[PDB]
Each structure stands twice: as structure tokens, then as C-alpha cells.
Design a protein around this ligand. Structure first.
Ligand SMILES: [Mn+3]
Ligand SMILES: [Mn+3]
Ligand SMILES: [Mn+3]
Ligand SMILES: [Mn+3]
Lengths: 198, 198, 198, 198
């Protein structure tokens, strides 16, 4: 089974960067619909699977990738945001970032470009290519999970669905992006990075 | 070459159904951005085409379909809404709805279903299948336009990107649907229908 | 579990239309790889599913749609071909076909156009739209199952992957199509049609 | 405007590796069809563009990417093969293969993996990621060309459509791969590499 995880701050710990109304509707509304559906779908799956009904397995795929990723994506997200965040990573993460993107500002520009360029709903991500042994930026449509659809370990995800920023920044997705840099939990991404060189 | 059309009613003319703040951002900001980027992409496409540079013709395609579609879809969208709309059609459009849907309500239910089911940004459509002589419900992803991607002649469209109802209905896409039913310009859907049956 | 079904004719019952070498390599080579993989994948699925590992469920989707459809598509195919086939359907099927496509020749042209137009690997199909209550033609990429990915009941499938005709007709896919009309099992498709109005 | 290039060796010059019958059909028939349909699509694209007819620009895209890509991919393909090829590269190309793959063989194994794994018609690529300064393996579906769809500069390509090995290797895509390794024109891959590092 799956459960909506608790936010490790409250709906306002992120003001003024991401306002309270968004952090509430986002977590308790969207993310919550994902997990119910994930569960409902996984169960409908178990059945189609037992009867070896391939038509069913196939028909349930989209709902399971959308809701599955909906759940994983947002769960990683919540951990990536922290009221005492922002700044620059420190330690190895920064060095890898220096190594892979040239500097932290270039890294910043690139991930902003990637998130700003997804047409429609999607996510911008910094991931770890365990195969090549280096950081990579990817962008995914709708709720497509990063690792699943790509094999990259998600380290940092930026939700660019309009519901992630509409009530506050409106159509101005680059502003929402300027903001999010102040509430990024570098401690956690360093963590997520650390477990990749494990 | 492409120009943002003008709305045939003022921004608040569809209240309480779609609040004027949505109407003002959607037309002036969103639809505006498409037209503009559309004009810029075609410009780039012509250079790429003039040199038979298949690489750049290929790279510019997403942008072209996205923005061109964005422009087409919304232009039809404003024409499908009217302050003096709502109700049901009559004459042939209705004869046809029954033929193919059984009843206006069943129709009414399928189009809502198709629109509510869009995963992420997209659109629900009532289209006309010319080859078939039939009316047809179809959903499209992002700004992929109906006719160009499906061959169906567009009759009525319902934008389901979050930007089209989030400031009002929040996550409740379903409430947005129940409401838009009241501002449907049946004078226009019927006009669109009368043209294929020529 | 899944098993490669027996062909209900032998690798030559279809000469000269589809030669023996093709009917053998196709059935015992391709179709056989599908079912092994289907099984292997379905099992790997059951596991990812129990541990609620969404990354895994997601990563195994493509192999399960490809191999699942690989198996269903080809199984339907074998039944659609018969040494004492060809001709025109008779009974209701023909009337529905007369109703939906205007005549049998138009139907023939359309399904030939659809199969001839799939870019890369794919299938051309005549299916039943149980919702609308009429015959519809669709085309699917690679091994995408018809019913699963579309909801249409498969009545008649024409495999247009190059392995379906290369050793015999070479790049000449329309010739392979002219041929297949002589070995079509109208008895079976009428059957498949019959169970749809059930 | 587009012309089928000429092969830089005779059709049987790559035996016993790729039989001359494959070479003659692939260049004269397959590649020929792309170029031709490419010239016809661009022609149609220019009319559609000249009228800002977004609908037709949208409808012609598959055809354009397909045929344009088909032309691009194959043209590079003939240059990547030579009767006096085989072996391993040397100089910087090899330095780089090691840097990024560890060893020529590991490289050799990943590209085969990527090529053998293509579901349906497609291509395996060894490309150059300029932004990164790295060599990169990438697979593409149908005729989607590397650079136009991925941004990677194409270095070596291995066609995995069935038409490229079926008359010889039949279903055994893997045997086709083991064989093509012997006709790789490393003089050309190196030339392609030397251009990005400019
Ligand atoms: Mn979200
Ligand atoms: Mn809109
Ligand atoms: Mn087959
Ligand atoms: Mn080829």
C-alpha cells in the first residue's frame, strides 16, 4: 500500500517563496489524488495480471505511470524544499556540480532552462547517471517518474505544472523559478547524491 | 503574420462562470505568447527550409506544433463561448448529436468525460469526422490541434490546461466543466457544423 | 501463463500468397520470442507490484506492451488467415462493412491505405467500436495491442512489420497487401464481429 | 533539392558481412524513397508555410521528420561503412572511447545493447554531446534523426530496421550486429569526431 507522506514543514514555512495556499492545495489536494489512484490502480492491476488479461494490463498502464509518478515525484519534491534552505550545496555535491556544469551558476541556468522549457505539464530534474558516474539534467512530461522512464536517480525535482505556481506567479513560470532557489534543501539533495556513490 | 484575435465580449462577460481574471490572463498573456512564438518559429522555419536543413526543420517542430496549435485552439475557443449562450443547440447540430450520441446529455457526458480525463495539459473536443459523416469526441495533448493531428474538423473545444480554471475552480477540473456548459456559443458550434455538411 | 498457439494450417497452406519461409520464421521465431518475454516480464511485474516498487513497474511497462501485444496481435493474425479464405464476407459483416465504408472495395482501399501508411513497424486493423456501434479502421505502432491502446475490438489485423513480408515482396509493401486479400478468413472475422453484437 | 547520394563502394563490397542484395535494396530502393518523398514534402511545406496554414504545417510533420530523417540517417550510414574497415579506432577517438566507456569493448557492448534493444524499427547511435564534451550512446525510433531530435552530433550509426539485415540474418538482429562491426569505417567516425572538437 501507499500513503500520502507528511510534509516536513507546514503550509507556510515556505512563504514568501511558495505561498501557503499552493503548498496546501498542492500536497493535500493533488498529491492525495495520486496516491488514492495509485492504490486503486495497483489493485486493478494485480487482477488483470492474475487472469493474464494483457488488454487490461495495457489499458491500466497510463493511470499507473501518471499516478505512480504523481506520488514519487511529489514525495521527492517535499523533501527537496526546506524553510532553512537555499544557498549553495557544499561538500562533494558542489564539486560534482562544478565538475559537471562548470560552476553552480551554469548549473542553475541549465536546470532553469530545462524546467522553463517543458511544454505543458512536467518536471525539471537534476539526476544521477549511475552508469556514467556524473550528474545529468532531464525533464519529464506530466508525472513520468525520472528513474523509471530514464534510469537517472532523482536528486532534485522542480515541479512545473501550472498548479505548482499559478495562483501566485500566474503565467510567469520564470519568476516562480527565481524563487524556488531560496527554499531548496541542499542537505537532502547532498544526501540523495551521497547514496548514489554507494 | 499571425495576430492575437480580439475577444467578441469583454473579459468579465462570462461571469460568474469564468472569472474575468482568468479571461484576461488567458487571452492577453497565454494566447499572446503562442502567437508571438509562432511568428518567430515560422520565420526560423523558412530559413531552415530554404537551405533544406532537415536538422533544423526537425528541431523546430515541437515549437511549431505547440505554438501554432496554441494559437489555433484558443482562437476557436473564444468563438465557442458567449455571454448569451448555454442551453442546447437545435436544428441539424442537435439532430446529429442525438444520431451519434443518442441524446444531448449523453453527448454532454462524454465530452466532459474526455475533458476531465486528460492527463496533464490538453483539450477535449467535439469534432466532425468528414470521411465518416459523423460527430466525434476527441482529446488532444498540450496544444496539439485537432484537425492537424487527427484530421477531425473542430466544432467545440474545451481547454483543460490548469491555466484555464485554476484561479477559480482550483484543482476541481469537474466544477470548471459543469460551469463552462453555460457559456457555450451554440450559434458558433452550429456554424462550424453547417460548413462540413456543404 | 502464456503459450505459443498452434497455427491452424501448416507453413505452406498460404502459398503462393505468403510463402512458407515467412510463415515459419514469423510464427516460430517472432511470435515465440514474444511469449517467452511476455511470461518473463509478467513475472518480473508481479514482483515489482508486491513490493509496490513503482520505478520497476514503470520500467517494465514497454516490454509488457511490446511483448503482450506481440503475443495478442499475432495470435489474432493466425486466425485471420485461411487457405480456403479470400472472397468477400457474407452475412451481416458485409452489410456492416457496406454500411460503414460504403462498399467492400472502399473498405479494402481504406484498410490498405492504413496498413501501407504506418511509418516503421506496425499493424493495420479493422476493429469494432462497441461504444458507437460501428466498424472502424485503426493502425498501431510496433506491437501496441488494439483493444488495450484504443478500446476497439480487433476483427482483422494485417501485420506490416517488415518481417511479415520482406524475404518475399522486399520493400514492396503494397504487393504484400494485394496478396493477403486472397488468404483472409472471412468466416473468423464474421465470428469476431458476431461476438461484438453480443 | 535532395539527392540520393552515391555509395563509396560497390554493393557487394561489404561481403560476407552485409550481402549485396541488402546493400542494393537499401540504397536504391529504401533510401531512394525517402529522398523522393522528402523533396515532395518540403514542396508541400513551403505552400503551407507561405499561407501560415498551421493546420497543414502540422499534418505534414510526420512525413517530413520521417523522410528527412530517413535521408540523413542513411547518408551518414553509408559513410560509416567501408570494405577496408573493422578493427578499432586510434588517436583521440579511441582516447575518448576509453575516457567515456572505459574500453573499446565496453563501448562496443553498450552500442550493441542499445541497437539490439530497439523495439521495432529504429537506430543505435554513437553521438557527441557537445554541451558536455562527451561521447554518448543513443537510440532513435523509426527515422527520427539523432541531432534534430536529441541535439547529439552523429558519429556512427547502426540501422536496426529489419530491412537492414533480414535477407541475411533473418530475425537474428544480434548476428547482424556482430558482423557490422567488421565493416565500420573508423576513418569516418574519427573525421566526425574531429569536427566537434574544433
Ligand atoms: Mn504537482
Ligand atoms: Mn489555454
Ligand atoms: Mn509479426
Ligand atoms: Mn535503412
Amino acid at each position: 500500500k501507499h500513503s500520502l507522506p507528511d510534509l516536513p514543514y507546514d503550509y507556510g514555512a515556505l512563504e514568501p517563496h511558495i505561498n501557503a495556499q499552493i503548498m496546501q492545495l498542492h500536497h493535500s489536494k493533488h498529491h492525495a489524488a495520486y496516491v488514492n489512484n495509485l492504490n486503486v490502480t495497483e489493485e486493478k492491476y494485480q487482477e488483470a495480471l492474475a487472469k493474464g488479461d494483457v488488454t487490461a494490463q495495457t489499458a491500466l498502464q497510463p493511470a499507473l505511470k501518471f499516478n505512480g509518478g504523481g506520488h514519487i515525484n511529489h514525495s521527492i519534491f517535499w523533501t527537496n524544499l526546506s524553510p532553512n534552505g537555499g544557498g549553495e550545496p557544499k561538500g562533494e555535491l558542489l564539486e560534482a556540480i562544478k565538475r559537471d556544469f562548470g560552476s553552480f551558476d551554469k548549473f542553475k541556468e541549465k536546470l532553469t532552462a530545462a524546467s522553463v522549457g517543458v511544454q505543458g505539464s512536467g518536471w525539471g530534474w537534476l539526476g544521477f547517471n549511475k552508469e556514467r558516474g556524473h550528474l545529468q539534467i532531464a525533464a519529464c512530461p506530466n508525472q513520468d517518474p525520472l528513474q523509471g522512464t530514464t534510469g537517472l536517480i532523482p536528486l532534485l525535482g522542480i515541479d512545473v505544472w501550472e498548479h505548482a505556481y499559478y495562483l501566485q506567479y500566474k503565467n510567469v513560470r520564470p519568476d516562480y523559478l527565481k524563487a524556488i532557489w531560496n527554499v531548496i534543501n541542499w542537505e537532502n539533495v547532498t544526501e540523495r547524491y551521497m547514496a548514489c556513490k554507494k
